[PDB]
Amino acid sequence: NLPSKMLLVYDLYLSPKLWALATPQKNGRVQEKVMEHLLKLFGTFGVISSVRILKPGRELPPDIRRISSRYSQVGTQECAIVEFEEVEAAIKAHEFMITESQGKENMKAVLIGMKP
């Protein structure tokens, strides 16, 4: 049995396409653009069971408010909570996420799951 297996996200809206290009949608603002685009990009390496995104100045849970505000560096504090089938999937995307988003303040991910 697994004790914990959750992942939190960052710097997805700072993409030149989302903030620099600004694409207004009838469905949902940055929330829809990022949520949808991430679906396929995430489903390819690992389907998501649920994605709870909390942007700044709104709702910052103890898990992110403490950790998210701690690794200040992505030039923007955007948090997202993903729940996949297992960390195995995520670990494959984590690297792919941080490796491609390395050096630049872009889409990132970190394994979140400690003892309460």
Domain residue extents for the chain: 1-116
The whole-angstrom separation of Cα 80 and Cα 38 is: 11
H helices within 46-86, ranges in order?
A: 62-67
Rg of the chain's alpha carbons, rounded to an integer?
14
SS3 state at 50: strand
Contact present, 27 and 114 (Cβ < 8 Å): no
Q: What is the end-to-end Cα distance of the chain in Å, rounded?
A: 17
Contact present, 39 and 107 (Cβ < 8 Å): no
The whole-angstrom separation of Cα 111 and Cα 92 is: 11
- What experimental approach yielded this model? NMR
